[PDB]
Amino acid sequence: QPFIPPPQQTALTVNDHDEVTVWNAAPCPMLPRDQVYVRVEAVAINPSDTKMRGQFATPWAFLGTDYAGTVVAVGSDVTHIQVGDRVYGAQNEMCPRTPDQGAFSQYTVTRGRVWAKIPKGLSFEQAAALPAGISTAGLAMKLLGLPLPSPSADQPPTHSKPVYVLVYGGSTATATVTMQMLRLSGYIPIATCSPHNFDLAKSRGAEEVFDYRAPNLAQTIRTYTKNNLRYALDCITNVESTTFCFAAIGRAGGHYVSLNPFPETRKMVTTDWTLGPTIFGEGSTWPAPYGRPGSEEERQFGEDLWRIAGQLVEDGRLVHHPLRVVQGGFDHIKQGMELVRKGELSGEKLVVRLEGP
Ligand SMILES: NC(=O)c1ccc[n+]([C@@H]2O[C@H](COP(=O)([O-])OP(=O)(O)OC[C@H]3O[C@@H](n4cnc5c(N)ncnc54)[C@H](OP(=O)(O)O)[C@@H]3O)[C@@H](O)[C@H]2O)c1
């Protein structure tokens, strides 16, 4: 009845020589009183995994954000979950004070309340594809100053004059979850991405979608939005996406939010960027002197977000990004990361269903 974690496990990490490495003698985490122990069944690959390298990498700390798995033990201070339940959530990868916690392990623990039970109708693979998307979508809306959806409302809030939100990179894993959430809160997303993903973008909430390569496209968008676009969410964050977003924003100003720190005007634009670890209310060691401290308000926001998003996912109002599923082990995760780093996925999320053993 007391739970004793296995003596060692396989986990994906980074070397002393900055190489991604399968480690077959990695530690297993201890079980917090307020968390559950998870045998990991599926994981999703995120670009942020592939950037944990150089001095962003903590050698021997576990990689990986998105996991879904089977509860094999339950903390003493936890009710409503039992052994055998299925959960999905986010880990805080490569955190130096919790090196034995990451999605890319055979055994992990839930973190904070940034997790939920998998609805009866979803697979481990569908559920694993969700966590970073949900967490980022909520953090982006928070930064933009937009209320999260009500899980109990019968329709989105009404706006006789549309409130537009530009989503640059409409086929990104983050944008497809975010656009559904924006629609639920009564906003009208307009998206830019490649033509082969137009159907995908519209299916996920874009009123209209445009090829970002199209000449003078920001004039088109300005006109579409009656020269009063006040919100832009940049899911790409490079020199070109930033220029484009600034150009599309209306003459009276607006708010630009990016998913990464943005590259090296007088235009009346407020700016923010999503810091992923803040979903846990934990803080970080960048950027870049002092990092950011943790905070109970950030902690409570992530818990509120996950309670809301967990229900939306439960009732079919929030759907996962299209999947590319690989059956395999930790080498398949490492191969997965290379595919993602090389920019080789479009309109799909790479999910590894773990063959145990
Ligand atoms: N700070 C955080 O915690 C956090 C969280 C989530 C994401 N992010 C960052 O956000 C970015 C997106 O990640 P994600 O997982 O949401 O997306 P993703 O699924 O990896 O996005 C891939 C898509 O980006 C588009 N694309 C790639 N390069 C582009 C370019 N130069 N210009 C226009 N479109 C481009 C392609 O779309 P088309 O083929 O349709 O053109 C491709 O389908 C990554 O940089 C990631 O590191 C950060």
Side-chain angles (χ1 to χ4, degrees):
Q1 160 97 69
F3 179 73
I4 300 295
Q8 60 172 218
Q9 61 169 332
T10 300
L12 196 74
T13 191
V14 168
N15 255 174
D16 284 302
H17 304 294
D18 197 58
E19 327 167 71
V20 181
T21 96
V22 177
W23 180 25
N24 293 118
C28 296
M30 289 215 298
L31 178 274
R33 309 204 82 87
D34 58 356
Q35 303 298 348
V36 297
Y37 216 81
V38 184
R39 184 175 79 225
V40 177
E41 306 276 11
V43 303
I45 312 295
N46 286 280
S48 299
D49 308 327
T50 77
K51 299 164 181 186
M52 304 292 99
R53 297 287 223 103
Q55 179 60 145
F56 308 104
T58 293
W60 311 110
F62 295 175
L63 289 167
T65 302
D66 284 335
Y67 69 88
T70 300
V71 185
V72 290
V74 176
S76 61
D77 291 340
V78 171
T79 48
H80 304 302
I81 291 96
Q82 8 103 24
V83 176
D85 277 348
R86 303 181 307 150
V87 293
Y88 67 116
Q91 268 284 179
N92 188 2
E93 71 181 325
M94 282 271 167
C95 164
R97 63 209 148 75
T98 59
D100 58 353
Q101 290 185 68
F104 300 166
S105 61
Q106 310 172 283
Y107 294 92
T108 195
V109 289
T110 56
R111 200 176 187 125
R113 289 288 178 268
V114 187
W115 52 281
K117 291 170 79 208
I118 305 181
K120 199 177 180 181
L122 273 61
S123 66
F124 291 113
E125 298 89 347
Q126 299 177 112
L130 287 168
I134 288 158
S135 303
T136 311
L139 291 175
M141 280 177 73
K142 178 181 199 200
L143 266 37
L144 256 353
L146 308 176
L148 302 181
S150 168
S152 58
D154 287 344
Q155 70 185 189
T158 299
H159 300 100
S160 63
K161 245 151 79 155
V163 180
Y164 290 108
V165 177
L166 173 60
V167 180
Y168 193 94
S171 64
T172 61
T174 304
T176 62
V177 165
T178 306
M179 287 189 304
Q180 300 174 247
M181 287 180 52
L182 292 169
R183 279 286 193 173
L184 293 167
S185 290
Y187 300 96
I188 296 104
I190 59 188
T192 63
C193 65
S194 296
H196 71 96
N197 292 317
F198 280 179
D199 279 351
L200 203 212
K202 297 175 85 100
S203 77
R204 301 301 207 269
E207 186 60 35
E208 204 37 273
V209 60
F210 302 95
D211 185 348
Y212 68 91
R213 305 170 181 85
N216 304 330
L217 175 66
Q219 170 69 246
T220 302
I221 304 308
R222 281 197 299 274
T223 296
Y224 191 100
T225 57
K226 321 304 184 184
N227 298 106
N228 199 213
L229 179 67
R230 303 197 84 111
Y231 301 104
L233 177 65
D234 182 355
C235 296
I236 303 303
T237 328
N238 57 28
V239 175
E240 297 80 60
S241 64
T242 307
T243 297
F244 180 92
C245 286
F246 275 63
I249 283 172
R251 54 170 133 258
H255 196 157
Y256 170 90
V257 166
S258 56
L259 299 183
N260 295 315
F262 38 93
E264 139 218 49
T265 357
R266 301 191 76 176
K267 184 145 181 182
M268 296 153 164
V269 180
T270 52
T271 69
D272 290 287
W273 52 264
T274 56
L275 178 56
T278 66
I279 199 70
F280 304 103
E282 284 192 1
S284 152
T285 10
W286 105 323
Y290 282 120
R292 191 183 295 196
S295 95
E296 176 76 26
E297 46 282 8
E298 290 172 354
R299 196 205 68 68
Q300 195 45 51
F301 177 81
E303 176 182 326
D304 290 345
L305 169 66
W306 269 82
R307 193 160 24 68
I308 294 155
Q311 189 65 57
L312 264 11
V313 168
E314 181 60 51
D315 47 58
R317 293 167 179 166
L318 205 65
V319 311
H320 58 88
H321 203 237
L323 318 177
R324 184 148 146 187
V325 182
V326 173
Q327 335 280 321
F330 287 84
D331 268 283
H332 298 259
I333 300 172
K334 186 189 174 171
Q335 284 160 215
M337 287 168 69
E338 276 297 293
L339 227 46
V340 167
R341 190 183 60 79
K342 280 163 172 184
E344 293 193 311
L345 291 177
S346 175
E348 297 182 301
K349 191 77 175 173
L350 203 52
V351 171
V352 174
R353 178 64 196 267
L354 286 187
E355 100 219 321

